[PDB]
Design an enzyme around this catalytic site. Structure first.
Site, short mmCIF file in Angstrom:
data_model
loop_
_atom_site.label_atom_id
_atom_site.label_comp_id
_atom_site.label_asym_id
_atom_site.label_seq_id
_atom_site.Cartn_x
_atom_site.Cartn_y
_atom_site.Cartn_z
N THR C 1 0.83 -1.20 0.00
CA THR C 1 0.00 0.00 0.00
C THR C 1 0.86 1.26 0.00
OG1 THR C 1 -1.82 -1.10 1.18
CG2 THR C 1 -1.78 1.31 1.20
N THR C 2 0.88 1.96 -1.13
CA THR C 2 1.66 3.18 -1.28
C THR C 2 0.85 4.22 -2.03
OG1 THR C 2 3.77 1.98 -1.27
CG2 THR C 2 3.76 4.20 -2.20
N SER C 168 3.85 -5.27 0.45
CA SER C 168 2.42 -5.09 0.26
C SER C 168 2.09 -4.18 -0.92
CB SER C 168 1.78 -4.53 1.53
OG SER C 168 2.29 -3.25 1.84
N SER C 169 3.10 -3.68 -1.63
CA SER C 169 2.89 -2.79 -2.76
C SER C 169 3.36 -3.47 -4.05
CB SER C 169 3.63 -1.47 -2.57
OG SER C 169 3.14 -0.77 -1.44
#
Lengths: 234, 237, 199, 228, 246, 240, 216, 235, 213
Positions: C1-2, C168-169
Site C-alpha cells: 500500500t503506497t 504489500s505494494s
C-alpha cells in the site's frame, strides 16, 4: 373550556390559581398561634354523624419532633404534600444532619406548588393546582415560628394565622386577642374562644383537637384526658 | 373541520390539498418544459422587480444533480425548502443504491414526501409543484411533474403557473400534428408558448432557459448571449 | 500500500499502486485506490481497505451535498476537513488513513494528509505501509519549480521504488494529473516501471 | 395524538362514512372470477395526449400469482402499495413461500383499521380489489377503507358501480371460460365507460396458472374487435 | 394539539354515564341476531346471516363465528372492523396464556383479560372505544361447559342462555319460557334454538345459507368443535318444518 | 373564520396569514440599512434612545454572527437573540465540519431553512424578526443578503429593514454605490439615517455603524467613535 | 483512550518583568519517526494570552477548534471582555477533567501563559488534571532539564528583563535539543508583552560540539 | 377574542396577547428601585406584608458575591428562575472559577424566557427582575422583561407608581455618578418615597436595601444598619 | 492504558484546642519524583469558623473543593446563615458517597469551632466515613504525625503527670516542630509551612520556614 391551565387572564392571572384559593372556603377551620412560649394549633373534627370515628380524622400532622402542621382545603391534595414534606425534611437530616428550619420547610414545599403544566413535562407532573392551605408551626434555633402557605406557594412569617371556611372572621379576631407577651396557655384560652364563635356546633372536649409545641418540649397532641382539662378553663 | 385540517369532506375530498393547489397560482409565474428527441428544455420567466435586486441571486432554475434539471412553480418559501430535501433524497439514493437517481424514482420519493403531509394532520403540505427533467440511458429523455397532492405522470410537455390550459392548448398544436422535436425546434415552441399567452415577446434578460442533451448530459443554463442567438434566429423564421 | 501526491505550479500529481492484499495473499492485484470525491477532488485510499472504502462514500455523500448547495466545486480544504472529522471522531472503530488532494480555483493544487486524525498542508505527501521506506528519495531529489514532466517522473520514481521495497505494494502505477483544464488518468504497465539499481 | 374518528349519536363512524363515499366516486373498475382465471379491467383515462401511458399504470402486481386494482385516491393507494408489498416481503421472509390471498388481504385490511383508531391520522381513501392464485383455485376479494374484506365471483367498483353489479348479476353465471370472462368483463365495462374505447383508455390484466400478468396494448386491441 | 378538536371522551354525563360507550351498544343493537345455549352434553351457538346476495362467495367458514382455541370458540355482533382486532387480541391473549401456564385457558380468565383492555381505552388514550359485543363458548377442567357474554363497556357475566344483536329481547323472553335448566341436553337444545330462530326472525323462508349453526362438545377426552354443513342444516329445516306446521 | 388561527391551516386564497402577521411586526421595528460596494459592505442602524437612564452602548443593534459575517436585525429582539446564537451555532458547526468560514450564500440558506421549519408546524410560531447578512472575502467579494420572516433570501446591492424601507431603497438607487468606497459609503449611510429620522414620534437616537471590507481587512468590525463623529460631520455638511 | 499517534515534544515557558516567553519545537513525531518538521505549536488567544501544548497534536487541533471558536465567539460578542489567562487555565482544567469520567481522556499537556494589567501569569494543566501556578514551567523532559535551570535564576534574580529572558530560553532551547532525542532543531520563540502576543518565525541555535574532540 | 388563547397564534396586527398579559403581571408586584454610581450600586427594595400580623416578605435574593437582584412579579416564578440564575452563577464558579459577568447572566435569563414563547403549551415566566452587580468595568443596573427583552441601565424603578421615581431619577442622574456610598442610600431611599402612598412612607421594618461596591461585596441590610441610613433624610 | 489516579503526597494536620482550632499543611506539590512547585497551598477557607484541608490526588482536590464551595452558597442562600463545622462534615459524607462506584481519591480533614466555641476536627476517607476527634492527621506523613500528638496533646501512656488543657502557645510550637521533624524524614513535606488558627475572634494565618530539601 376553550383555554388551557396556563392561559392568562386579561388582568394577567391564572384562572386555575384563582379558583384554587376560592376552593379553600369549603375546607375545615384551623387556627394557629405563635407565642414566645411556643406555637399553638387547634382544629375542629367536623363530625356530621355519630357513626364516624374521630380517631380517623387527623387535621394536625407532625412533620418533625419540634415541627407541627395544620390542614384545610382539599383533603386529597394535602396527603400528597404531607408525605412529600416529611421526606424532604428527612432528606435534610440525611444530608446536613440537622433539623430543617421551618422557613426551609415552607421553601421546599412551595417549589412543587406552581410546577403544574401540560406540555414539556414528565409523567409525574400535576395537572391541577393544590386546593390545600397549610400552616407550619414549630420551634427552632430562632424560637417558636408559625408560617402559612396558599395554593400560589407564597409563604410568609405570621404571628397568628387562621385557615378554612371561618378564616375570614377568625383572622380579624386573632388581631384582637393577641397582645404583646401573651403566653401559650393564654393563647390556648383565646384559641377556644375564637374557635367556638366561628363553629356552628358546640365546643366539646372530643370535638376539637389541640396540639402545642414548646422550646423545652417536643410537639405534643393533647389526649382526651388533657383536652377535658383545657376546655374546663373556659 | 374538513376545511381546517386534512380529513375527509362529506364528498370524500380534501380541501387542504385543494388549497395547496391554489397556493401554486399565488406565485405569479409561469413555466414550461418540453421533452424533445435528444433534449429536454425548461423555460421560465426571471422576475427582478427591484433595480437593487441582484439578478444572479434570483434564479428559478434549480439543479438537483448533474443530469437532472429542476424548476419550481409555487410558493417560493415552500419551493426552496423542497429542493433542499430533494437534494437530500437524491444523495440518499446514490449513498444507498449506488448510481445517479432517475427522474422517475426521484419524483416518486418526492411525491411520497407529500403523501406523509396529506395523511398526517400534524404537518401541512407544501404549496409548490416540482417539474423535473433528465435523460435516462434506457428510455431516453425523461420529463416529469409532481403536484403537491403526490401525483406524477410522464409528460411529453409540462405546464404550470398562472397559464395552464392555454399553455397546454398550444402544446396540443405541436403534438397532434406530430412535429419534429429537436434542440432548436423545442426552444421554438417553448418561447412561442409563453410569449403568445402573456403578450410580451420576452427579452433574453427577462428569462432563463435550462437545457440538457444526449451529447451534453450535464444540465446547464443558457447564457443571455446564447438566448439572444436562440431569440433573433427564432424570430427569423 | 503506497500513495503519493506532489504539488507543482499548474496542479498536483497523485499516484497509487494497484496491489490490494489482505494478509499475505493478494485479494486483487489490479485495483484503483483513487476514489473521486468530485471532478477535481480525489482521495487516495490507504490503511484498512474496508474502512477506507466506507469513509470514501461517507465523504462523497457530504461533499456532493456541499458542492450542490454552493453550485461550485468545493475547496480542497473543505474536502480535507470532512475526512478528518470522520477520522478523528470515529477513529475508535475506524483505523483507515486517507490522503486528500485536488485542485480549486482559489489556491490551485493542494495536498492534505488526513492520516491519524490531524490535518496539515504539504508540497508533497506520501502515505501507506510503503511510504516509510521512500523518505530518502522524496527528500533529497525534490527540487522547487519542477515541470509537469519532471513531476510525473519524480512521482513515478518514488512509487516504483516503494513497490520494490514494500512487500504489500505492487501491480501497476496509477497516475492522476489534476489541473485547471481537467484531469488526466494514466496507467504505467509493469514494463514501463523505471528501472533502478538491480543488484 | 387524539383520535379523529369518533362514534356518532347513531353509533356509526363519521370519518369512515366519507371514506366509503369517496371510493364510490372513483375510477370505474370491474372484475370477474370465471373458470381457471380472473379478469381485471380498469379505467385509465388521460386528459391530454401529452400524458405518457407507459409511465403510470393503475393495474399493479403484488407478486407473481397475485395482483391488485383500485378505485379511489391516487396517493393513498401507493402507500397501500408499499406496505402491502412489504407485507408480502415480510411474509416471504418468515414463511419463504408465496403468500395466500386470504392472509394477504387480512393483514393489509388491518392497516386500514389502525387509522380508524390512532390519532392525528385520516383513514385510507382507497378501496382495494385483490386478485390471487393459490393451490389451483382462483381468488377474487374486495376490500374497502372500513377494513372489512369480502369475497365475490364478480363485482364492480367506482363510478356507477351499482349498474355494473346488476349487469353481471343478469349476464354473468357459472361455466364461463377465461376467454368469455374477458369478453364479459369488457361488456360490463362498456356500460360504465363513456366515449370511444381504445387500448390506452382501458388497462386489463389477468391471473391464471402462469400467475398474474398484465395485458399488452397489442392483445387488448384484438379484444376490442369484439372477438373474445 | 388544538383543544377545539378534542371531544374529551372521558367526560361523565350528569347522570354518571359515558356517551361513547352508550353509542357503542346502540351500534351493536343493529347487528344481526346471535344466540347461544349452555346444555348438559354440549354447548350450542347459532346465528343468522344478514348479508344475502346471489353473487356472494362465502367459501370459507362461518360469518360471525370464530374459533378462539382448541377448547373455546366465540361469536361476533358489532362492527366487523373492531371484531378483527378483538379476535386477534383474544387469540393473542389465549396464546400468551399458553406461554406461561402451558394449559388450556379457563373461560373466565380469557374474558376478564380482554375486558381489562376495553376499560383501559375508555379510561385514557383518547382513542374511541370498541363497538363489538362478543359471546364465548367452550369447556374447561374446572367449570366444564361454559357460555359467557361481553359488553363493549368491559362488563361481562355468565349465562346459561342469552342472545345478542337484533331480536335479543325477543329471544331472551322465549328462553325464560321453554329453556329447562339441568334437563334439556345438547340434542334437545338444538331443536329449541331452531324454534327460537324461526319465530324471532321476521324474514321468511329460512334456508341453510341464511343461517349458521356450530356445535362444541367434549367426546372421549377431546373437545370436538364443528359447523353443520348446509345439507345437515337443511335436514334440521325438514325436522323443524314438520314440528312447526304439522 | 378560523383559517388564520394556525400556520398549518391554509387561507381560502391559499396563503398563511400567520407568516404575514409576523411580517407586520417587523414594520414596527427601527430602521436599519446596509450597502455593498467594491471596497466592502457598510452597515448602519438607527438605535432609538428609550430613556436617559440607559448606559452608553446598551441595546446594541449590531450583531456579529461570524468573523467575516455581520448582521443587523429589525424585529422582535427576543427572536433576534435566539436566531443570533442559532446562526452562530450554524457557523461554528460549519467550521467544526469543513474547517473554514461559511460563505454568505451558504449561511443564508441554512438559516432561512431553519426559519421556514417553524412556519410549517402549528405547535410552534414563526419568527417575527427580519435581518440582513453582509460578508466580504477576497475570492467572493462584498455580498449582502436579507432574510424575511418567511425564510427567503435575496441578494441585494443594498437593503433597508424596519419601519422606513422603500423610501430608503429609492434614495440608494439615485446614485451608483458600486464604484464607491466604504469611506464614501458611510457618508451616504449617515446621510440616509438623518433623512429617515425626524422629530414627530421618536425623540432621540444614536448612530451605530459597522464596516467590513478592505478597511477592516475583510473582518467584521465596528466603526470607532472618532471616525463615526467625522462621518457625521460629513453628513452635517448638508442635511439639506 | 485507545491509540493516539501524532506525538508531540517538550514545551518551555517562564516569567520575566512585564511579559512571558513560551517556546516549543515545530516537529511532530509519529512513533520513532520525525515526520512533520513544520508545525505551529504555539497558538495566540486574543491579545494578552497565549497557549502551547504537547502530547497528541491531533487532540491539540481539536482543542484548537473548541477553544478557538469559544474565544472567537467572545470577540464576536464584543461585550468589552476578554478571557483572562486564569480563565483559559481554569476552563482547560475542567475540560480535561471531564474526559476522565467518560473514560475517553485526551492525551495532551498544555501550558497557559499571559500578561494582563501588569499581572504576569504562567500556568500548567495536564491530562491528569493537575493544575497550579509557577514562575517557570516546562513539559516532558523539560521539567527534568529546563526547569532547574530557570529555578536557579529565579532564586538569584527574581526580576528578569525581556532580553535576559530570551537569552535564557535559547540557552534552555540549546540544552533541550542536546539531551532530548525526540526534540528538534527548528523552534519558535513567542513572547507576550504589553503590546500583545508576538510570535517569531523559525529559529535555530548555535551548538558547541567540542565534546567530540574532548572525548576522542 | 380567539387570539388570546395561547402564545403561538399571532394577532392580525402581529402581536401576542399572552406576552402582554405576562408584561402586565410584573406591574402588579411591589415597587422597587435601584441605581449605580461610578463606584457603588444600591438596590432599594420595598417589602410588603400579607397582613398586619404577618412579617414582611423578602424581595432581595443573594446571587453572587458581587451580584444582587430584586424580584417583582409572581413569587414562585421568580423562585424557579432564581434556582436557574443561581445555578448558572454556581456553574460559572464551578467551571470558570470567576464571578459570572452580570451581562452574561442576564443574557442567559432571556434565553430561558425565550424557550417558552416559541412553543405551544409552555407559559412564559411572568416575573420581572431588577438585577445589579459589580465587575471589572464597574457596577451595572440591568432590567429584564417576561417578553425576554433586557436592557442596560444607569438606574431604574419598577412596579406601580414608578414614574414619579423615574422622574426623580432623571433630575438627579447627574449627581448619581459622583455621589459616594452614604449619598447613594440617601438618593435611593428618597427615590423609593415617590412610589409609596401618601400615608405610609418610610419604616425600617418594611424597607430594606443592599449595596455592592469596588472592594465591597454585596451585603444585605434590614433594620439595625438601615435605621441610621433613614436618619438625616427629610421627606 | 490510562491511570486515573496518582499519589501527589503532602501532609495535613488538625488539632482542636479548648477555645481554638488549629489547621496546618505544607506548600509542597510534587508528583512522582519531581517537584511541580514549592508553593501550592492546600488549606482552603470555607467560612470564618471552618477551614478544610485536602491531601491526596490533586485533580480531585481541586474539583471536590469547588463542589463544596458551590454547595456552601446553596445552603447560605437557602438558610440565610453559614454552615456549622459539623454540618459541612456530614455534607461531604454524602458527596463522597455519590461517587461510591467511582470514588474520589482524596483524604479530607475539616476543622474549626462549633456553636459552643470548641474545636471540632473531622477526618474523612475516600468512601465518606467520618468521626469527631480532638486531633487528626492525614497525607503521606499521617503515620508520623499521630504518635507525637498522642503523647504531647493526648497525655497518653504517662503515669502521674499533671494534665493541663491544650494552650494556644504550646499548640503552635507543637504543630511547627512536628512538621520540622516531618520535613526531615518526609520527601513530600517541606519548603514552607502555612498555619491557620481559627479562634473566637477570627482566623489568623502564619508562615514558618522549612528546609528546601
Amino acid at each position: 373550556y376553550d383555554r388551557g391551565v396556563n392561559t392568562f387572564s386579561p388582568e394577567g392571572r391564572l384562572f386555575q390559581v384563582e379558583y384554587a384559593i376560592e376552593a379553600i372556603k369549603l375546607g375545615s377551620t384551623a387556627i394557629g398561634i405563635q407565642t414566645s412560649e411556643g406555637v399553638c394549633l387547634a382544629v375542629e373534627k367536623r363530625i356530621t354523624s355519630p357513626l364516624m370515628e374521630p380517631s380517623s380524622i387527623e387535621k394536625i400532622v407532625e412533620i418533625d419532633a419540634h415541627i407541627g402542621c395544620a390542614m384545610s382545603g382539599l383533603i386529597a391534595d394535602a396527603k400528597t404534600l404531607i408525605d412529600k414534606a416529611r421526606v424532604e425534611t428527612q432528606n435534610h437530616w440525611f444530608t446536613y444532619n440537622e433539623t430543617m428550619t421551618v422557613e426551609s420547610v415552607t421553601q421546599a414545599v412551595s417549589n412543587l406548588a406552581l410546577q403544574f403544566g401540560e406540555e414539556d413535562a414528565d409523567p409525574g407532573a400535576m395537572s391541577r393546582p393544590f386546593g390545600v392551605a397549610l400552616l407550619f408551626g414549630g420551634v427552632d434555633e430562632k424560637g417558636p415560628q408559625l408560617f402559612h402557605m396558599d395554593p400560589s406557594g407564597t409563604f410568609v412569617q405570621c404571628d397568628a394565622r387562621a385557615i378554612g371556611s371561618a378564616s375570614e372572621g377568625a383572622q380579624s379576631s386573632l388581631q384582637e386577642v393577641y397582645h404583646k407577651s401573651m403566653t401559650l396557655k393564654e393563647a390556648i384560652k383565646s384559641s377556644l374562644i375564637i374557635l367556638k364563635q366561628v363553629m356552628e356546633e358546640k365546643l366539646n372536649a372530643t370535638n376539637i383537637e389541640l396540639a402545642t409545641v414548646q422550646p423545652g418540649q417536643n410537639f405534643h397532641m393533647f389526649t382526651k384526658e388533657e383536652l377535658e382539662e383545657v376546655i374546663k378553663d373556659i | 373541520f374538513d376545511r381546517h385540517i386534512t380529513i375527509f369532506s362529506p364528498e370524500g375530498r380534501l380541501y387542504q390539498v385543494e388549497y395547496a393547489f391554489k397556493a401554486i397560482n399565488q406565485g405569479g409565474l409561469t413555466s414550461v418544459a418540453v421533452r424533445g428527441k435528444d433534449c429536454a428544455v425548461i423555460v421560465t420567466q426571471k422576475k427582478v422587480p427591484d433595480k437593487l435586486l441582484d439578478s444572479s441571486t434570483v434564479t428559478h432554475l434549480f439543479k438537483i444533480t448533474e443530469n437532472i434539471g429542476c424548476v419550481m412553480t409555487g410558493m417560493t418559501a415552500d419551493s426552496r425548502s423542497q429542493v433542499q430535501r430533494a437534494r437530500y433524497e437524491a444523495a440518499n439514493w446514490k449513498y444507498k443504491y449506488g448510481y445517479e437517481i432517475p427522474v422517475d424514482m426521484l419524483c416518486k420519493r418526492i411525491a411520497d414526501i407529500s403523501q406523509v403531509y396529506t395523511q398526517n394532520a400534524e404537518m401541512r403540505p407544501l404549496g409548490c409543484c416540482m417539474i423535473l427533467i433528465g435523460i435516462d440511458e434506457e428510455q431516453g429523455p425523461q420529463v416529469y411533474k409532481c403536484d403537491p397532492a403526490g401525483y406524477y405522470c410522464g409528460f411529453k410537455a409540462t405546464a404550470a403557473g398562472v397559464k395552464q390550459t392555454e399553455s397546454t392548448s398550444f402544446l396540443e398544436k405541436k403534438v397532434k400534428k406530430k412535429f419534429d422535436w429537436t434542440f432548436e425546434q423545442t426552444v421554438e415552441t417553448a418561447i412561442t408558448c409563453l410569449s403568445t399567452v402573456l403578450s410580451i415577446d420576452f427579452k433574453p434578460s427577462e428569462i432563463e432557459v435550462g437545457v440538457v442533451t444526449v451529447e451534453n448530459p450535464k444540465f446547464r443554463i443558457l447564457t443571455e448571449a446564447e438566448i439572444d442567438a436562440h431569440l433573433v434566429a427564432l424570430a427569423e423564421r | 500500500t503506497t500513495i503519493m501526491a506532489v504539488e507543482f505550479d499548474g496542479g498536483v500529481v497523485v499516484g497509487s499502486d494497484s496491489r490490494v492484499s489482505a494478509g499475505e495473499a493478494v485479494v486483487n492485484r489490479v485495483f484503483d485506490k483513487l476514489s473521486p470525491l468530485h471532478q477535481h477532488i480525489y482521495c487516495a485510499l490507504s490503511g484498512s481497505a474496508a474502512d477506507a472504502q466506507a469513509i470514501a462514500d461517507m465523504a462523497a455523500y457530504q461533499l456532493e451535498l456541499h458542492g450542490m448547495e454552493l453550485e461550485e466545486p468545493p475547496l480542497v480544504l473543505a474536502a480535507a476537513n470532512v475526512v478528518r472529522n470522520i477520522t478523528y471522531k470515529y477513529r475508535e472503530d475506524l483505523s483507515a488513513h486517507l490522503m486528500v488532494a485536488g485542485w480549486d480555483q482559489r489556491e490551485g493544487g493542494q495536498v492534505y494528509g488526513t492520516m491519524s486524525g490531524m490535518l496539515i498542508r504539504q508540497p508533497f505527501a506520501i502515505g501507506g505501509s510503503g511510504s516509510t521506506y521512500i523518505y530518502g528519495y522524496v527528500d533529497a531529489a525534490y527540487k522547487p519549480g519542477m515541470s509537469p514532466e519532471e513531476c510525473r517522473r519524480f512521482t513515478t520514481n518514488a512509487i516504483a521504488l516503494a513497490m520494490k521495497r514494500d512487500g504489500s505494494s505492487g501491480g501497476v502505477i496509477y497516475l492522476a494529473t489534476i489541473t485547471g483544464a481537467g484531469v488526466d488518468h494514466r496507467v504505467i504497465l509493469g514494463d514501463e516501471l523505471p528501472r533502478f539499481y538491480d543488484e | 395524538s387524539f383520535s379523529l374518528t369518533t362514534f356518532s349519536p347513531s353509533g356509526k363512524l363519521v370519518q369512515i362514512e366519507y371514506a366509503l363515499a369517496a371510493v364510490a366516486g372513483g375510477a370505474p373498475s370491474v372484475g370477474i372470477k370465471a373458470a381457471n382465471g380472473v379478469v381485471l379491467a380498469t379505467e385509465k383515462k388521460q386528459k391530454s395526449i401529452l400524458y405518457d401511458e407507459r409511465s403510470v399504470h393503475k393495474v399493479e402486481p403484488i407478486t407473481k400469482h397475485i395482483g391488485l386494482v383500485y378505485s379511489g385516491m391516487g396517493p393513498d393507494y401507493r402507500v397501500l402499495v408499499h406496505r402491502a408489498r412489504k407485507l408480502a416481503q415480510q411474509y416471504y421472509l418468515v414463511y419463504q413461500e408465496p403468500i395466500p390471498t386470504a392472509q394477504l388481504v387480512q393483514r393489509v385490511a388491518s392497516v386500514m383499521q389502525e387509522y380508524t383508531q390512532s390519532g392525528g391520522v385520516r383513514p385510507f381513501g382507497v378501496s382495494l380489489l385483490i386478485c390471487g392464485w393459490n393451490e389451483g383455485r382462483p381468488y377474487l376479494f374486495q376490500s374497502d377503507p372500513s377494513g372489512a374484506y369480502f369475497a365475490w365471483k364478480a363485482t364492480a367498483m367506482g363510478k356507477n358501480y351499482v349498474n355494473g353489479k346488476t349487469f353481471l348479476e343478469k349476464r354473468y353465471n357459472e361455466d364461463l371460460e377465461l376467454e368469455d370472462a374477458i369478453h364479459t368483463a369488457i361488456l360490463t365495462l362498456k356500460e360504465s365507460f363513456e366515449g370511444q374505447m381504445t387500448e390506452d383508455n382501458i388497462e386489463v390484466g389477468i391471473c391464471n396458472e402462469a400467475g398474474f400478468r398484465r395485458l399488452t396494448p397489442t392483445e387488448v386491441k384484438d379484444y376490442l374487435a369484439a372477438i373474445a | 394539539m388544538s383543544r377545539r378538536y378534542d371531544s374529551r371522551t372521558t367526560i361523565f354525563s350528569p347522570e354518571g354515564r359515558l356517551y361513547q360507550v352508550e353509542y357503542a351498544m346502540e351500534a351493536i343493537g343493529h347487528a344481526g341476531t346471535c344466540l347461544g345455549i349452555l346444555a348438559n352434553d354440549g354447548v350450542l351457538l347459532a346465528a343468522e346471516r344478514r348479508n344475502i346476495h346471489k353473487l356472494l362467495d362465502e367459501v370459507f367458514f362461518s360469518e360471525k363465528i370464530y374459533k378462539l382455541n382448541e377448547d373455546m370458540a366465540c361469536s361476533v355482533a358489532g362492527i366487523t372492523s373492531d371484531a378483527n382486532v378483538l379476535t386477534n387480541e383474544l387469540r393473542l391473549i389465549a396464546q400468551r396464556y399458553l406461554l406461561q401456564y402451558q394449559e388450556p385457558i379457563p373461560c373466565e380468565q380469557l374474558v376478564t383479560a380482554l375486558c381489562d383492555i376495553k376499560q383501559a381505552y375508555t379510561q385514557f388514550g383518547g382513542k374511541r372505544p370498541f363497538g363489538v359485543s362478543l359471546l364465548y363458548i367452550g369447556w374447561d377442567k374446572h367449570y366444564g361447559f361454559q357460555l359467557y357474554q361481553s359488553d363493549p363497556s368491559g362488563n361481562y357475566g355468565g349465562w346459561k342462555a342469552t342472545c345478542i344483536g337484533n331480536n335479543s329481547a325477543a329471544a331472551v323472553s322465549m328462553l325464560k319460557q321453554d329453556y329447562k335448566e339441568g334437563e334439556m341436553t345438547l340434542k334437545s337444545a338444538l331443536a329449541l334454538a331452531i324454534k327460537v330462530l324461526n319465530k324471532t326472525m321476521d324474514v321468511s323462508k329460512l334456508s341453510a345459507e341464511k343461517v349458521e349453526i356450530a356445535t362444541l362438545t367434549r367426546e372421549n377426552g377431546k373437545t370436538v368443535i364443528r359447523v353443520l354443513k348446509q345439507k345437515e342444516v337443511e335436514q334440521l329445516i325438514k325436522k323443524h318444518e314438520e314440528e312447526e306446521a304439522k | 373564520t378560523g383559517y388564520d388561527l394556525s400556520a398549518s391551516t391554509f387561507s381560502p386564497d391559499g396563503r398563511v396569514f400567520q407568516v404575514e402577521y409576523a411580517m407586520k411586526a417587523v414594520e414596527n421595528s427601527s430602521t436599519a440599512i446596509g450597502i455593498r460596494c467594491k471596497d466592502g459592505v457598510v452597515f448602519g442602524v438607527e438605535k432609538l434612545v428609550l430613556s436617559k437612564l440607559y448606559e452608553e452602548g446598551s441595546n446594541k443593534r449590531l450583531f456579529n454572527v461570524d468573523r467575516h459575517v455581520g448582521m443587523a436585525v429589525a424585529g422582535l429582539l427576543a427572536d433576534a437573540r435566539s436566531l443570533a446564537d442559532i446562526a452562530r451555532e450554524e457557523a461554528s458547526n460549519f467550521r467544526s465540519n469543513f474547517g473554514y468560514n461559511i460563505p454568505l450564500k451558504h449561511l443564508a440558506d441554512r438559516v432561512a431553512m431553519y426559519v421556514h421549519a417553524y412556519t410549517l408546524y402549528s405547535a410552534v410560531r414563526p419568527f417575527g424578526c427580519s435581518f440582513m447578512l453582509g460578508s466580504y472575502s477576497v475570492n467572493d467579494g462584498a455580498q449582502l443578503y436579507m432574510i424575511d420572516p418567511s425564510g427567503v433570501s435575496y441578494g441585494y446591492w443594498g437593503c433597508a429593514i424596519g419601519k422606513a424601507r422603500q423610501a430608503a431603497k429609492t434614495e440608494i438607487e439615485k446614485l451608483q454605490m458600486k464604484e464607491m468606497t466604504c469611506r464614501d459609503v458611510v457618508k451616504e449611510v449617515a446621510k440616509i439615517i438623518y433623512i429617515v429620522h425626524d422629530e414627530v414620534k421618536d425623540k432621540a437616537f444614536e448612530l451605530e455603524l459597522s464596516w467590513v471590507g478592505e478597511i477592516t481587512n475583510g473582518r467584521h468590525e465596528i466603526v470607532p467613535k472618532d471616525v463615526r463623529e467625522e462621518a457625521e460631520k460629513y453628513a452635517k455638511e448638508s442635511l439639506k | 483512550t485507545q491509540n493516539p499517534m501524532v506525538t508531540g515534544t517538550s514545551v518551555l515557558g517562564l516569567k520575566f518583568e512585564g511579559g512571558v516567553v513560551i517556546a516549543a519545537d515545530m516537529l511532530g513525531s509519529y512513533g520513532s519517526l520525525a515526520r512533520f518538521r513544520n508545525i505551529s505549536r504555539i497558538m495566540r488567544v486574543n491579545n494578552s494570552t497565549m497557549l502551547g501544548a504537547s502530547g497528541d497534536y491531533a487532540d491539540f487541533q481539536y482543542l484548537k477548534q473548541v477553544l478557538g471558536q469559544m474565544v472567537i465567539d467572545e470577540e464576536l460578542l464584543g461585550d468589552g471582555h476578554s478571557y483572562s489567562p486564569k480563565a483559559i487555565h481554569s476552563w482547560l482544567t475542567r475540560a480535561m477533567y471531564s474526559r476522565r469520567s467518560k473514560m475517553n481522556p485526551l492525551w495532551n499537556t498544555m501550558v497557559i501563559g499571559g500578561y494582563a494589567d501588569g499581572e504576569s501569569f504562567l500556568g500548567y494543566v495536564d491530562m491528569l488534571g493537575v493544575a497550579y501556578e509557577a514562575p517557570s514551567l516546562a513539559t516532558g523532559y523539560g521539567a527534568y532539564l529546563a526547569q532547574p535551570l530557570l529555578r536557579e535564576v529565579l532564586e538569584k534574580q527574581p526580576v528578569l528583563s525581556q532580553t535576559e529572558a530570551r537569552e535564557l530560553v535559547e540557552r534552555c532551547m540549546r540544552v533541550l535539543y542536546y539531551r532530548d532525542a525526540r526534540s528538534y532543531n527548528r523552534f519558535q520563540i513567542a513572547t507576550v508583552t504589553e503590546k500583545g502576543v508576538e510570535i517569531e518565525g523559525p529559529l535555530s541555535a548555535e551548538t558547541n560540539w567540542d565534546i567530540a574532540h574532548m572525548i576522542s | 377574542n380567539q387570539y388570546d388563547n395561547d402564545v403561538t397564534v399571532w394577532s392580525p396586527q402581529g402581536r401576542i396577547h399572552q406576552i402582554e398579559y405576562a408584561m402586565e403581571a410584573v406591574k402588579q408586584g411591589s415597587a422597587t428601585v435601584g441605581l449605580k454610581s461610578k463606584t457603588h450600586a444600591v438596590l432599594v427594595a420595598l417589602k410588603r406584608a400579607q397582613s398586619e400580623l404577618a412579617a414582611h416578605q423578602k424581595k432581595i435574593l443573594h446571587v453572587d458575591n458581587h451580584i444582587g437582584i430584586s424580584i417583582a412579579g409572581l413569587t414562585a416564578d421568580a423562585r424557579l428562575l432564581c434556582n436557574f440564575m443561581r445555578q448558572e452563577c454556581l456553574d460559572s464558579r464551578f467551571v470558570f472559577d470567576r464571578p459570572l459577568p452580570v451581562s452574561r447572566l442576564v443574557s442567559l435569563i432571556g434565553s430561558k424566557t425565550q424557550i417558552p414563547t416559541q412553543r405551544y403549551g409552555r407559559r412564559p415566566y411572568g416575573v420581572g427582575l431588577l438585577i445589579a452587580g459589580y465587575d471589572d468595568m464597574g457596577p451595572h443596573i440591568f432590567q429584564t422583561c417576561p417578553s425576554a427583552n433586557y436592557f442596560d441601565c444607569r438606574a431604574m424603578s419598577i412596579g406601580a407608581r414608578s414614574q414619579s421615581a423615574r422622574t426623580y431619577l432623571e433630575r438627579h442622574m447627574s449627581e448619581f455618578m459622583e455621589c459616594n456610598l452614604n449619598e447613594l442610600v440617601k438618593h435611593g431611599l428618597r427615590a423609593l418615597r415617590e412610589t409609596l402612598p401618601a400615608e405610609q412612607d418610610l419604616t425600617t421594618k418594611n424597607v430594606s436595601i443592599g449595596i455592592v461596591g469596588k472592594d465591597l461585596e454585596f451585603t444585605i441590610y434590614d433594620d439595625d444598619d438601615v435605621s441610621p441610613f433613614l436618619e438625616g433624610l427629610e421627606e | 492504558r490510562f491511570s486515573p489516579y496518582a499519589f501527589n503526597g503532602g501532609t495535613v494536620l488538625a488539632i482542636a484546642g479548648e477555645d481554638f482550632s488549629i489547621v496546618a499543611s505544607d506548600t509542597r506539590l510534587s508528583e512522582g519524583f519531581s517537584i511541580h512547585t514549592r508553593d501550592s497551598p492546600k488549606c482552603y477557607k470555607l467560612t470564618d469558623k471552618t477551614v478544610i484541608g485536602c491531601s491526596g490526588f490533586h485533580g480531585d482536590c481541586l474539583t471536590l473543593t469547588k463542589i463544596i464551595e458551590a454547595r456552601l452558597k446553596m445552603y447560605k442562600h437557602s438558610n440565610n446563615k453559614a454552615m456549622t463545622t459539623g454540618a459541612i462534615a456530614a455534607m461531604l459524607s454524602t458527596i463522597l458517597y455519590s461517587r461510591r462506584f467511582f470514588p474520589y481519591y482524596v483524604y479530607n480533614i475539616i476543622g474549626g469551632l462549633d456553636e459552643e466555641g470548641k474545636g471540632a476536627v473531622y477526618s474523612f476517607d475516600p468512601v465518606g466515613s467520618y468521626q469527631r476527634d480532638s486531633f487528626k492527621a492525614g497525607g503521606s506523613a499521617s503515620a508520623m504525625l499521630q504518635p507525637l500528638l498522642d503523647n504531647q496533646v493526648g497525655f497518653k501512656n504517662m503515669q502521674n503527670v499533671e494534665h493541663v488543657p491544650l494552650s494556644l502557645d504550646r499548640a503552635m510550637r507543637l504543630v511547627k516542630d512536628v512538621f520540622i521533624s516531618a520535613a526531615e524524614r518526609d520527601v513530600y513535606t517541606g519548603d514552607a509551612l502555612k498555619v491557620c488558627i481559627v479562634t473566637k475572634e477570627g482566623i489568623r494565618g502564619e508562615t514558618v520556614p522549612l528546609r528546601k530539601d
